[PDB]
PDB file of all heavy atoms in Angstrom:
ATOM      1  N   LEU Q 654    -126.245 -43.765-128.315  1.00  8.98           N
ATOM      2  CA  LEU Q 654    -126.040 -43.326-126.945  1.00  8.98           C
ATOM      3  C   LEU Q 654    -127.297 -43.266-126.151  1.00  8.98           C
ATOM      4  O   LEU Q 654    -128.337 -42.896-126.666  1.00  8.98           O
ATOM      5  CB  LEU Q 654    -125.340 -41.964-126.909  1.00  8.98           C
ATOM      6  CG  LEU Q 654    -124.030 -41.829-127.708  1.00  8.98           C
ATOM      7  CD1 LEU Q 654    -123.415 -40.472-127.462  1.00  8.98           C
ATOM      8  CD2 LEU Q 654    -123.024 -42.940-127.359  1.00  8.98           C
ATOM      9  N   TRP Q 655    -127.182 -43.635-124.883  1.00  5.75           N
ATOM     10  CA  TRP Q 655    -128.211 -43.646-123.884  1.00  5.75           C
ATOM     11  C   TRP Q 655    -127.804 -42.560-122.888  1.00  5.75           C
ATOM     12  O   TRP Q 655    -126.872 -42.753-122.121  1.00  5.75           O
ATOM     13  CB  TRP Q 655    -128.233 -45.024-123.204  1.00  5.75           C
ATOM     14  CG  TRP Q 655    -129.308 -45.166-122.179  1.00  5.75           C
ATOM     15  CD1 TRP Q 655    -129.222 -44.869-120.848  1.00  5.75           C
ATOM     16  CD2 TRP Q 655    -130.641 -45.639-122.401  1.00  5.75           C
ATOM     17  NE1 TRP Q 655    -130.423 -45.112-120.235  1.00  5.75           N
ATOM     18  CE2 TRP Q 655    -131.303 -45.621-121.155  1.00  5.75           C
ATOM     19  CE3 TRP Q 655    -131.324 -46.144-123.526  1.00  5.75           C
ATOM     20  CZ2 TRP Q 655    -132.622 -46.075-121.002  1.00  5.75           C
ATOM     21  CZ3 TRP Q 655    -132.642 -46.549-123.383  1.00  5.75           C
ATOM     22  CH2 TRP Q 655    -133.269 -46.536-122.132  1.00  5.75           C
ATOM     23  N   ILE Q 656    -128.460 -41.398-122.947  1.00  6.86           N
ATOM     24  CA  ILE Q 656    -128.129 -40.265-122.090  1.00  6.86           C
ATOM     25  C   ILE Q 656    -129.245 -40.017-121.102  1.00  6.86           C
ATOM     26  O   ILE Q 656    -130.389 -39.838-121.510  1.00  6.86           O
ATOM     27  CB  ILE Q 656    -127.769 -39.004-122.937  1.00  6.86           C
ATOM     28  CG1 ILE Q 656    -126.787 -39.330-124.089  1.00  6.86           C
ATOM     29  CG2 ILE Q 656    -127.261 -37.850-122.069  1.00  6.86           C
ATOM     30  CD1 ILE Q 656    -125.268 -39.655-123.693  1.00  6.86           C
ATOM     31  N   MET Q 657    -128.909 -40.023-119.803  1.00  5.95           N
ATOM     32  CA  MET Q 657    -129.855 -39.802-118.722  1.00  5.95           C
ATOM     33  C   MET Q 657    -129.700 -38.429-118.092  1.00  5.95           C
ATOM     34  O   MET Q 657    -128.600 -37.897-118.017  1.00  5.95           O
ATOM     35  CB  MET Q 657    -129.769 -40.914-117.654  1.00  5.95           C
ATOM     36  CG  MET Q 657    -130.445 -42.219-118.060  1.00  5.95           C
ATOM     37  SD  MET Q 657    -132.235 -42.165-118.446  1.00  5.95           S
ATOM     38  CE  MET Q 657    -132.921 -41.612-116.864  1.00  5.95           C
ATOM     39  N   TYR Q 658    -130.807 -37.868-117.628  1.00  4.42           N
ATOM     40  CA  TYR Q 658    -130.868 -36.551-117.013  1.00  4.42           C
ATOM     41  C   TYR Q 658    -131.630 -36.589-115.731  1.00  4.42           C
ATOM     42  O   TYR Q 658    -132.471 -37.463-115.563  1.00  4.42           O
ATOM     43  CB  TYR Q 658    -131.543 -35.553-117.968  1.00  4.42           C
ATOM     44  CG  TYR Q 658    -130.623 -35.102-119.072  1.00  4.42           C
ATOM     45  CD1 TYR Q 658    -130.628 -35.735-120.309  1.00  4.42           C
ATOM     46  CD2 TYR Q 658    -129.696 -34.087-118.861  1.00  4.42           C
ATOM     47  CE1 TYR Q 658    -129.749 -35.355-121.318  1.00  4.42           C
ATOM     48  CE2 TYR Q 658    -128.829 -33.679-119.871  1.00  4.42           C
ATOM     49  CZ  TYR Q 658    -128.861 -34.317-121.101  1.00  4.42           C
ATOM     50  OH  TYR Q 658    -128.004 -33.941-122.107  1.00  4.42           O
ATOM     51  N   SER Q 659    -131.370 -35.625-114.836  1.00  4.09           N
ATOM     52  CA  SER Q 659    -132.094 -35.509-113.573  1.00  4.09           C
ATOM     53  C   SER Q 659    -132.292 -34.047-113.224  1.00  4.09           C
ATOM     54  O   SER Q 659    -131.465 -33.231-113.585  1.00  4.09           O
ATOM     55  CB  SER Q 659    -131.378 -36.257-112.443  1.00  4.09           C
ATOM     56  OG  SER Q 659    -130.300 -35.525-111.869  1.00  4.09           O
ATOM     57  N   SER Q 660    -133.382 -33.717-112.528  1.00  5.62           N
ATOM     58  CA  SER Q 660    -133.684 -32.354-112.079  1.00  5.62           C
ATOM     59  C   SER Q 660    -134.165 -32.382-110.620  1.00  5.62           C
ATOM     60  O   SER Q 660    -135.015 -33.204-110.265  1.00  5.62           O
ATOM     61  CB  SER Q 660    -134.747 -31.717-112.972  1.00  5.62           C
ATOM     62  OG  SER Q 660    -135.056 -30.390-112.576  1.00  5.62           O
ATOM     63  N   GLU Q 661    -133.610 -31.490-109.780  1.00  7.76           N
ATOM     64  CA  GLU Q 661    -134.000 -31.355-108.374  1.00  7.76           C
ATOM     65  C   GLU Q 661    -135.372 -30.667-108.295  1.00  7.76           C
ATOM     66  O   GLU Q 661    -136.225 -31.096-107.524  1.00  7.76           O
ATOM     67  CB  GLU Q 661    -132.950 -30.553-107.583  1.00  7.76           C
ATOM     68  CG  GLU Q 661    -131.589 -31.231-107.455  1.00  7.76           C
ATOM     69  CD  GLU Q 661    -130.373 -30.313-107.412  1.00  7.76           C
ATOM     70  OE1 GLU Q 661    -130.544 -29.072-107.464  1.00  7.76           O
ATOM     71  OE2 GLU Q 661    -129.240 -30.844-107.348  1.00  7.76           O
ATOM     72  N   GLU Q 662    -135.586 -29.626-109.126  1.00  6.63           N
ATOM     73  CA  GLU Q 662    -136.818 -28.829-109.204  1.00  6.63           C
ATOM     74  C   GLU Q 662    -138.026 -29.608-109.772  1.00  6.63           C
ATOM     75  O   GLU Q 662    -139.171 -29.262-109.471  1.00  6.63           O
ATOM     76  CB  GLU Q 662    -136.558 -27.517-109.986  1.00  6.63           C
ATOM     77  CG  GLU Q 662    -137.590 -26.413-109.779  1.00  6.63           C
ATOM     78  CD  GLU Q 662    -138.088 -26.210-108.358  1.00  6.63           C
ATOM     79  OE1 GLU Q 662    -137.317 -25.681-107.524  1.00  6.63           O
ATOM     80  OE2 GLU Q 662    -139.245 -26.598-108.076  1.00  6.63           O
ATOM     81  N   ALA Q 663    -137.771 -30.664-110.566  1.00  7.47           N
ATOM     82  CA  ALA Q 663    -138.818 -31.510-111.136  1.00  7.47           C
ATOM     83  C   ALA Q 663    -139.030 -32.792-110.338  1.00  7.47           C
ATOM     84  O   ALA Q 663    -140.124 -33.358-110.381  1.00  7.47           O
ATOM     85  CB  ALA Q 663    -138.501 -31.837-112.583  1.00  7.47           C
ATOM     86  N   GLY Q 664    -137.995 -33.221-109.614  1.00  9.34           N
ATOM     87  CA  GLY Q 664    -138.003 -34.428-108.793  1.00  9.34           C
ATOM     88  C   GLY Q 664    -137.857 -35.687-109.621  1.00  9.34           C
ATOM     89  O   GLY Q 664    -136.783 -35.955-110.166  1.00  9.34           O
ATOM     90  N   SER Q 665    -138.944 -36.459-109.734  1.00  7.46           N
ATOM     91  CA  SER Q 665    -138.983 -37.706-110.498  1.00  7.46           C
ATOM     92  C   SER Q 665    -139.517 -37.525-111.926  1.00  7.46           C
ATOM     93  O   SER Q 665    -139.344 -38.414-112.767  1.00  7.46           O
ATOM     94  CB  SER Q 665    -139.748 -38.783-109.739  1.00  7.46           C
ATOM     95  OG  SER Q 665    -139.004 -39.196-108.604  1.00  7.46           O
ATOM     96  N   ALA Q 666    -140.143 -36.369-112.205  1.00  6.66           N
ATOM     97  CA  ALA Q 666    -140.649 -36.030-113.539  1.00  6.66           C
ATOM     98  C   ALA Q 666    -139.467 -35.528-114.392  1.00  6.66           C
ATOM     99  O   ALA Q 666    -139.529 -35.568-115.626  1.00  6.66           O
ATOM    100  CB  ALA Q 666    -141.734 -34.961-113.441  1.00  6.66           C
ATOM    101  N   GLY Q 667    -138.400 -35.099-113.706  1.00  5.72           N
ATOM    102  CA  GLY Q 667    -137.151 -34.627-114.294  1.00  5.72           C
ATOM    103  C   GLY Q 667    -136.180 -35.736-114.643  1.00  5.72           C
ATOM    104  O   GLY Q 667    -135.131 -35.467-115.228  1.00  5.72           O
ATOM    105  N   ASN Q 668    -136.507 -36.984-114.263  1.00  3.91           N
ATOM    106  CA  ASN Q 668    -135.706 -38.164-114.583  1.00  3.91           C
ATOM    107  C   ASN Q 668    -136.128 -38.578-115.965  1.00  3.91           C
ATOM    108  O   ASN Q 668    -137.206 -39.134-116.145  1.00  3.91           O
ATOM    109  CB  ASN Q 668    -135.945 -39.288-113.587  1.00  3.91           C
ATOM    110  CG  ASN Q 668    -135.435 -38.996-112.197  1.00  3.91           C
ATOM    111  OD1 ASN Q 668    -134.581 -38.119-111.972  1.00  3.91           O
ATOM    112  ND2 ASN Q 668    -135.953 -39.742-111.238  1.00  3.91           N
ATOM    113  N   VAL Q 669    -135.324 -38.195-116.954  1.00  4.13           N
ATOM    114  CA  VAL Q 669    -135.591 -38.405-118.379  1.00  4.13           C
ATOM    115  C   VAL Q 669    -134.349 -38.897-119.103  1.00  4.13           C
ATOM    116  O   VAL Q 669    -133.221 -38.691-118.652  1.00  4.13           O
ATOM    117  CB  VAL Q 669    -136.161 -37.114-119.061  1.00  4.13           C
ATOM    118  CG1 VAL Q 669    -137.617 -36.870-118.676  1.00  4.13           C
ATOM    119  CG2 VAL Q 669    -135.310 -35.880-118.758  1.00  4.13           C
ATOM    120  N   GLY Q 670    -134.582 -39.517-120.243  1.00  4.99           N
ATOM    121  CA  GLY Q 670    -133.527 -40.011-121.100  1.00  4.99           C
ATOM    122  C   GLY Q 670    -133.742 -39.598-122.539  1.00  4.99           C
ATOM    123  O   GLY Q 670    -134.878 -39.369-122.974  1.00  4.99           O
ATOM    124  N   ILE Q 671    -132.641 -39.528-123.284  1.00  3.51           N
ATOM    125  CA  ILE Q 671    -132.611 -39.241-124.703  1.00  3.51           C
ATOM    126  C   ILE Q 671    -131.684 -40.261-125.358  1.00  3.51           C
ATOM    127  O   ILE Q 671    -130.707 -40.708-124.743  1.00  3.51           O
ATOM    128  CB  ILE Q 671    -132.199 -37.783-125.026  1.00  3.51           C
ATOM    129  CG1 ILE Q 671    -130.805 -37.433-124.454  1.00  3.51           C
ATOM    130  CG2 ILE Q 671    -133.287 -36.777-124.566  1.00  3.51           C
ATOM    131  CD1 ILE Q 671    -129.951 -36.579-125.307  1.00  3.51           C
ATOM    132  N   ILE Q 672    -132.018 -40.664-126.583  1.00  5.59           N
ATOM    133  CA  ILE Q 672    -131.184 -41.580-127.356  1.00  5.59           C
ATOM    134  C   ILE Q 672    -130.594 -40.762-128.492  1.00  5.59           C
ATOM    135  O   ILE Q 672    -131.327 -40.062-129.157  1.00  5.59           O
ATOM    136  CB  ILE Q 672    -131.955 -42.828-127.867  1.00  5.59           C
ATOM    137  CG1 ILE Q 672    -132.328 -43.752-126.690  1.00  5.59           C
ATOM    138  CG2 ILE Q 672    -131.175 -43.582-128.961  1.00  5.59           C
ATOM    139  CD1 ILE Q 672    -133.676 -44.513-126.886  1.00  5.59           C
ATOM    140  N   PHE Q 673    -129.279 -40.819-128.677  1.00  6.77           N
ATOM    141  CA  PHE Q 673    -128.641 -40.126-129.768  1.00  6.77           C
ATOM    142  C   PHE Q 673    -128.176 -41.190-130.747  1.00  6.77           C
ATOM    143  O   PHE Q 673    -127.417 -42.101-130.378  1.00  6.77           O
ATOM    144  CB  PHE Q 673    -127.461 -39.280-129.266  1.00  6.77           C
ATOM    145  CG  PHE Q 673    -126.681 -38.635-130.384  1.00  6.77           C
ATOM    146  CD1 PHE Q 673    -127.084 -37.420-130.925  1.00  6.77           C
ATOM    147  CD2 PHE Q 673    -125.536 -39.240-130.895  1.00  6.77           C
ATOM    148  CE1 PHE Q 673    -126.333 -36.805-131.925  1.00  6.77           C
ATOM    149  CE2 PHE Q 673    -124.837 -38.661-131.952  1.00  6.77           C
ATOM    150  CZ  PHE Q 673    -125.234 -37.444-132.451  1.00  6.77           C
ATOM    151  N   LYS Q 674    -128.636 -41.072-131.987  1.00  6.53           N
ATOM    152  CA  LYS Q 674    -128.287 -41.988-133.059  1.00  6.53           C
ATOM    153  C   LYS Q 674    -127.719 -41.231-134.244  1.00  6.53           C
ATOM    154  O   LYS Q 674    -128.310 -40.269-134.729  1.00  6.53           O
ATOM    155  CB  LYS Q 674    -129.500 -42.864-133.469  1.00  6.53           C
ATOM    156  CG  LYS Q 674    -129.149 -44.022-134.430  1.00  6.53           C
ATOM    157  CD  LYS Q 674    -130.005 -45.269-134.234  1.00  6.53           C
ATOM    158  CE  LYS Q 674    -131.413 -45.133-134.748  1.00  6.53           C
ATOM    159  NZ  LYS Q 674    -132.209 -46.364-134.498  1.00  6.53           N
ATOM    160  N   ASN Q 675    -126.543 -41.661-134.678  1.00  5.21           N
ATOM    161  CA  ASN Q 675    -125.849 -41.158-135.837  1.00  5.21           C
ATOM    162  C   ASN Q 675    -125.502 -42.333-136.756  1.00  5.21           C
ATOM    163  O   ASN Q 675    -124.960 -43.349-136.302  1.00  5.21           O
ATOM    164  CB  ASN Q 675    -124.595 -40.369-135.455  1.00  5.21           C
ATOM    165  CG  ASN Q 675    -123.745 -40.022-136.653  1.00  5.21           C
ATOM    166  OD1 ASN Q 675    -124.193 -39.361-137.588  1.00  5.21           O
ATOM    167  ND2 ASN Q 675    -122.545 -40.561-136.708  1.00  5.21           N
ATOM    168  N   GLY Q 676    -125.821 -42.159-138.037  1.00  5.63           N
ATOM    169  CA  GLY Q 676    -125.555 -43.130-139.091  1.00  5.63           C
ATOM    170  C   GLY Q 676    -126.772 -43.642-139.831  1.00  5.63           C
ATOM    171  O   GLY Q 676    -126.625 -44.231-140.903  1.00  5.63           O
ATOM    172  N   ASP Q 677    -127.974 -43.436-139.269  1.00  7.55           N
ATOM    173  CA  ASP Q 677    -129.230 -43.862-139.890  1.00  7.55           C
ATOM    174  C   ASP Q 677    -130.138 -42.697-140.217  1.00  7.55           C
ATOM    175  O   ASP Q 677    -130.174 -41.712-139.482  1.00  7.55           O
ATOM    176  CB  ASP Q 677    -129.981 -44.865-138.997  1.00  7.55           C
ATOM    177  CG  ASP Q 677    -129.640 -46.317-139.274  1.00  7.55           C
ATOM    178  OD1 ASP Q 677    -129.830 -46.763-140.431  1.00  7.55           O
ATOM    179  OD2 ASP Q 677    -129.237 -47.022-138.325  1.00  7.55           O
ATOM    180  N   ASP Q 678    -130.876 -42.799-141.326  1.00  5.66           N
ATOM    181  CA  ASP Q 678    -131.838 -41.766-141.707  1.00  5.66           C
ATOM    182  C   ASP Q 678    -133.081 -42.021-140.855  1.00  5.66           C
ATOM    183  O   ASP Q 678    -133.618 -43.120-140.892  1.00  5.66           O
ATOM    184  CB  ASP Q 678    -132.131 -41.802-143.221  1.00  5.66           C
ATOM    185  CG  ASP Q 678    -133.348 -41.011-143.664  1.00  5.66           C
ATOM    186  OD1 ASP Q 678    -133.621 -39.947-143.062  1.00  5.66           O
ATOM    187  OD2 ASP Q 678    -134.024 -41.451-144.620  1.00  5.66           O
ATOM    188  N   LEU Q 679    -133.471 -41.028-140.034  1.00  5.67           N
ATOM    189  CA  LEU Q 679    -134.577 -41.131-139.087  1.00  5.67           C
ATOM    190  C   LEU Q 679    -135.922 -40.557-139.564  1.00  5.67           C
ATOM    191  O   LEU Q 679    -136.914 -40.709-138.858  1.00  5.67           O
ATOM    192  CB  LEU Q 679    -134.183 -40.501-137.744  1.00  5.67           C
ATOM    193  CG  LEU Q 679    -133.245 -41.309-136.821  1.00  5.67           C
ATOM    194  CD1 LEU Q 679    -133.096 -40.627-135.484  1.00  5.67           C
ATOM    195  CD2 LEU Q 679    -133.733 -42.751-136.601  1.00  5.67           C
ATOM    196  N   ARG Q 680    -135.954 -39.934-140.750  1.00  8.58           N
ATOM    197  CA  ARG Q 680    -137.129 -39.308-141.386  1.00  8.58           C
ATOM    198  C   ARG Q 680    -138.337 -40.221-141.509  1.00  8.58           C
ATOM    199  O   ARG Q 680    -139.446 -39.777-141.244  1.00  8.58           O
ATOM    200  CB  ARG Q 680    -136.775 -38.739-142.773  1.00  8.58           C
ATOM    201  CG  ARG Q 680    -136.019 -37.411-142.741  1.00  8.58           C
ATOM    202  CD  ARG Q 680    -135.746 -36.859-144.140  1.00  8.58           C
ATOM    203  NE  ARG Q 680    -135.126 -37.857-145.021  1.00  8.58           N
ATOM    204  CZ  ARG Q 680    -135.286 -37.899-146.340  1.00  8.58           C
ATOM    205  NH1 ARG Q 680    -136.023 -36.982-146.956  1.00  8.58           N
ATOM    206  NH2 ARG Q 680    -134.696 -38.849-147.057  1.00  8.58           N
ATOM    207  N   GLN Q 681    -138.124 -41.479-141.933  1.00  5.61           N
ATOM    208  CA  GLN Q 681    -139.167 -42.499-142.066  1.00  5.61           C
ATOM    209  C   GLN Q 681    -139.720 -42.911-140.679  1.00  5.61           C
ATOM    210  O   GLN Q 681    -140.932 -43.047-140.525  1.00  5.61           O
ATOM    211  CB  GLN Q 681    -138.631 -43.715-142.857  1.00  5.61           C
ATOM    212  CG  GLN Q 681    -139.616 -44.883-142.922  1.00  5.61           C
ATOM    213  CD  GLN Q 681    -139.827 -45.513-144.273  1.00  5.61           C
ATOM    214  OE1 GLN Q 681    -139.661 -44.906-145.343  1.00  5.61           O
ATOM    215  NE2 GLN Q 681    -140.279 -46.747-144.234  1.00  5.61           N
ATOM    216  N   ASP Q 682    -138.845 -43.086-139.673  1.00  8.20           N
ATOM    217  CA  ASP Q 682    -139.275 -43.449-138.318  1.00  8.20           C
ATOM    218  C   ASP Q 682    -140.166 -42.359-137.733  1.00  8.20           C
ATOM    219  O   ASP Q 682    -141.190 -42.680-137.134  1.00  8.20           O
ATOM    220  CB  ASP Q 682    -138.070 -43.686-137.402  1.00  8.20           C
ATOM    221  CG  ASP Q 682    -137.357 -44.981-137.685  1.00  8.20           C
ATOM    222  OD1 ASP Q 682    -136.511 -45.001-138.607  1.00  8.20           O
ATOM    223  OD2 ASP Q 682    -137.648 -45.980-136.994  1.00  8.20           O
ATOM    224  N   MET Q 683    -139.774 -41.077-137.916  1.00  9.76           N
ATOM    225  CA  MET Q 683    -140.510 -39.904-137.441  1.00  9.76           C
ATOM    226  C   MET Q 683    -141.878 -39.861-138.095  1.00  9.76           C
ATOM    227  O   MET Q 683    -142.855 -39.659-137.390  1.00  9.76           O
ATOM    228  CB  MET Q 683    -139.731 -38.601-137.717  1.00  9.76           C
ATOM    229  CG  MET Q 683    -140.476 -37.355-137.231  1.00  9.76           C
ATOM    230  SD  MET Q 683    -139.771 -35.741-137.633  1.00  9.76           S
ATOM    231  CE  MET Q 683    -139.398 -35.952-139.370  1.00  9.76           C
ATOM    232  N   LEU Q 684    -141.954 -40.081-139.436  1.00 13.19           N
ATOM    233  CA  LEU Q 684    -143.215 -40.113-140.175  1.00 13.19           C
ATOM    234  C   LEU Q 684    -144.120 -41.208-139.622  1.00 13.19           C
ATOM    235  O   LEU Q 684    -145.273 -40.929-139.319  1.00 13.19           O
ATOM    236  CB  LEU Q 684    -142.979 -40.303-141.695  1.00 13.19           C
ATOM    237  CG  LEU Q 684    -144.241 -40.436-142.578  1.00 13.19           C
ATOM    238  CD1 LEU Q 684    -145.169 -39.241-142.415  1.00 13.19           C
ATOM    239  CD2 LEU Q 684    -143.880 -40.620-144.038  1.00 13.19           C
ATOM    240  N   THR Q 685    -143.585 -42.435-139.455  1.00 12.24           N
ATOM    241  CA  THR Q 685    -144.320 -43.581-138.915  1.00 12.24           C
ATOM    242  C   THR Q 685    -144.904 -43.275-137.549  1.00 12.24           C
ATOM    243  O   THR Q 685    -146.106 -43.459-137.340  1.00 12.24           O
ATOM    244  CB  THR Q 685    -143.456 -44.849-138.931  1.00 12.24           C
ATOM    245  OG1 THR Q 685    -143.095 -45.103-140.275  1.00 12.24           O
ATOM    246  CG2 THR Q 685    -144.184 -46.065-138.378  1.00 12.24           C
TER     247      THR Q 685
END
C-alpha cells in the first residue's frame, strides 16, 4: 500500500507517504 498524508499546520512538510507491506520479512532491509 501507498498511503499519503497531508497537514494544514505543516503545509508542504506535512505532505508525507508511508508504504505498508505485509508478507515479507523486513528485518534484513532495516539492518541494511
